[PDB]
Each structure stands twice: as structure tokens, then as C-alpha cells.
Design a protein around this ligand. Structure first.
Ligand SMILES: N[C@@H](CCC(=O)N[C@@H](CS)C(=O)NCC(=O)O)C(=O)O
Ligand SMILES: N[C@@H](CCC(=O)N[C@@H](CS)C(=O)NCC(=O)O)C(=O)O
Lengths: 208, 208
């Protein structure tokens, strides 16, 4: 398997964490895409991924699987025992809900804030920027932190009693938040504690 | 099971189609949320869904499953034989990729265009609007149509040889597109043909 990514990207982190979690890092050849050079916006990479983002998985037969959620679903089901994406119908549903909600309310908006209301990847890569939109996404992400704090006052992991794809998305959300110095509010005690715990997981600790 | 939705909403259509597809419509009590009155933005509905959108599934024990993808994953796995979200690892991966890509490149941007660069749900509901962002999402959606046309010149359904959650997302994308009169380009022959076929499916035909 090939993963096209940048090693320190927060979305890439979602797949790298999931790979470690599945003891599969050794099954993967990582190929560097230089986002700083806008390599992801040029025809060669766009042929690997219409949406122009990393990571993207390429299988031995050339099948391309793009999107963190889809890659995770692929690698989680491979060894026949899913430990990230759910076994029962309720688990699959709640994990996908929380995974998507973490994208919507935390990770995606931090990333839109990076690209739109900061220099981001630089003026040659960020050809269009909407600062007003980017700033509102910053605020959305802050609300997201408060939302995930309320979740974590009631359960030990984002989707319930077990570690899942959803924790990985929030972790990636907080990694991005650190990149842009969007501070987790002091009063977000449950989110802070959970994150410290997450940073103790081998998969996460090695990466950071 | 309860679904909170509005009957003619394109995102709601994704779940209603999936329910029909799984022969499960009779297992569902539909409860009306009035988006035109901004009911989805008030405290009572926000307690059902932090993200403030429809549809949302509520189980007999009060468990809430939000997000079209998550609801579909839940109901597809219920009867033990998934026909929408994939059996093999490759199927799960490709279907999730295409499902997410249809959201990203077609349905979501049409919807953002509706809410931001048209009157949308009206000036009392659409309290903030970014017309410039909304118009760029319109353009993104147009590109999406061209993208899905290229996919459908090579395979009969969005994710491959079989009907899946991914077709449902594109269908919902085109339903929304019709609402806002964003015309499918003439040269998008494969997308047009596929859509006519989709409108022949009982699940889709009844809904429209
Ligand atoms: N797989 C992601 C998208 C990934 C993503 O936005 N990755 C970042 C890298 S951290 C990226 O490609 N940014 C490049 C850009 O926006 O120009 C998804 O789940 O939608
Ligand atoms: N489940 C959807 C979101 C659903 C959605 O945007 N639904 C529309 C109804 S067609 C909505 O609630 N719009 C209300 C609004 O934006 O104010 C998702 O998959 O993210």
C-alpha cells in the first residue's frame, strides 16, 4: 500500500494514527507530497485525487482510496476485526456520527481558518482567500471545543466507552489547533484531560 | 425509530431513499421540523443535534444518530446484510470515499450556495450570509457535476458495479441542484443518463 501525504499534516495524522493503531505502519510506503510547493494543486496529484488533498491511499493494483474516513474504514476492515469503526450497528452509527461531527465542528473549520484567514501555505498556494469566512470558521472551531468538552464530561472517549476513529479526528483537530495557536479554553477541563490521555497512546505519542 | 426531518429536504432524501432501499420506511415515525420557521436553530432541536440540521435519527431508547452518512451506516447494518455501505474492505472504502466526495464536491456546495448566495430560508433564518463564498460553492458544484460525469462514463453507479450510499448522495445533490435551478450542463451526458435511471428506482420515484 502507498499513502501520499505530508508527514506533519493533521489530516495525514488521522491515517497514520489509525495505521499504528492497526499495527499496519510497516505495510505502507509513504510518498511525500510537497504542499508548501502547491504540489497537491498540480495535474499529476489531481489525477490521484480530484479533491486535491492528502492523504490518499493507493493499493497494489492501483485502486485509489481518498478521504481520511474512507481510508480508515478500508484499513480497519482489512484484518477482519474492526476496532476503530464499529462492530454492531449502533457502534458503526455513533462512531460515524461523532467522526463526521468532529470534522464538521472542529477539524474542518480549523483547517479552513488556516487556509483562509492566515497566510496558510503562502500567497502562491493560497490563490483565493476569504478572511471573513476563515474567521467565522475559527469561531466555529472554538464552539466545537466546548461541544467536545461536554461530550467528554460524560464519556471516556469521543464515541463512548472505547477508542475509535472519532477520537482520532478530534486529536487531529487539536493538532491543527496547536499549529494555528487556537488555544483550548481553560474551562474545557474534560477535553484537556482526554487529550493528555490521547497523547499517551503509543500511536499518538510516536507521531508527535 | 424516529426521524426528525422536513419531507422535501435533499439531505432528508438521502435517508428516506436509504430507508426505502432497505424496506424499512414502515419502521420509522417521521416528525416534522419546520426549517422555514428556523425551528432547527432553536434550543429544543439543538438538544437533538448540536449541528442544527436534519435528518436526525432517534432510537427507541433515546439514542440520537445524526448525519446522513451515520444514519445510513446504522440502518444498512441493522438487518445484517449491507447493500449500501459495502461488504468487503474495498467496497467499504470506495463507497465511503465516493459518498464523502459527493458531499464535498456536489451536495454540500449546492447547499452552501442556497443558504449563502440566495435568499435561502429567508432573512429571519439566514442571519449571516457570505454571498461571495456562496457563489464560489456554486462554481464548485458545477465542477462536481463534470467530475461525476467522468466517473459515470466508466461505471454504471457512482462507486462501481452496484448501487450504493454514494449514488444516493449524488441523487440528493441533483435534487438540490434542481431546487436552485443550477442546471446540469448539456455535455454531462453520462451524469444525465444515470440520473434518469436513478429516477426509475422505486425508492427514488416514490419520493419525487
Ligand atoms: N481527507 C481529508 C481532507 C484532507 C485535507 O484537507 N488535508 C490537508 C493536509 S493537512 C490538505 O490537503 N490541505 C491542502 C490545502 O488545503 O491546500 C478529508 O477527510 O476531507
Ligand atoms: N446530514 C447532513 C447535514 C444536513 C443538512 O445540511 N440538512 C439541511 C436540510 S436539506 C438543513 O438542515 N439545512 C438547514 C440550514 O442550513 O439552516 C450532513 O450529512 O452533514
Amino acid at each position: 500500500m502507498i499513502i501520499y501525504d505530508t508527514p506533519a499534516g493533521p489530516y495525514p495524522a488521522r491515517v497514520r494514527i489509525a495505521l499504528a493503531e492497526k499495527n499496519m505502519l510497516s505495510s505502507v510506503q509513504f510518498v511525500r507530497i510537497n504542499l508548501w510547493k502547491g504540489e497537491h494543486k498540480k495535474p499529476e496529484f489531481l489525477a490521484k485525487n480530484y479533491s486535491g488533498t492528502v492523504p490518499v491511499l493507493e493499493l497494489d493494483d492501483g485502486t485509489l482510496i481518498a478521504e481520511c474516513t474512507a481510508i480508515t474504514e478500508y484499513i480497519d476492515a482489512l484484518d477482519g476485526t474492526p476496532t476503530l469503526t464499529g462492530k454492531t450497528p449502533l457502534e458503526k452509527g455513533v462512531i460515524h456520527m461523532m467522526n463526521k461531527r468532529a470534522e464538521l465542528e472542529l477539524l474542518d473549520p480549523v483547517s479552513v481558518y488556516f487556509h483562509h484567514a492566515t497566510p496558510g501555505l503562502g500567497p502562491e498556494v493560497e490563490l483565493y482567500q476569504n478572511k471573513e469566512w476563515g474567521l467565522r470558521q475559527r469561531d466555529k472551531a472554538l464552539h466545537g471545543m466546548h461541544y467536545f468538552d461536554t461530550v467528554l464530561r460524560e464519556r471516556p472517549y469521543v464515541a463512548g466507552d472505547s477508542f475509535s476513529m472519532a477520537d482520532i479526528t478530534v486529536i487531529a483537530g487539536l493538532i491543527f489547533a496547536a499549529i494555528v495557536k487556537l488555544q483550548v479554553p481553560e474551562e474545557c477541563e474534560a477535553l484537556r484531560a482526554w487529550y493528555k490521555r490521547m497523547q499517551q497512546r503509543p500511536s499518538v505519542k510516536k507521531l508527535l
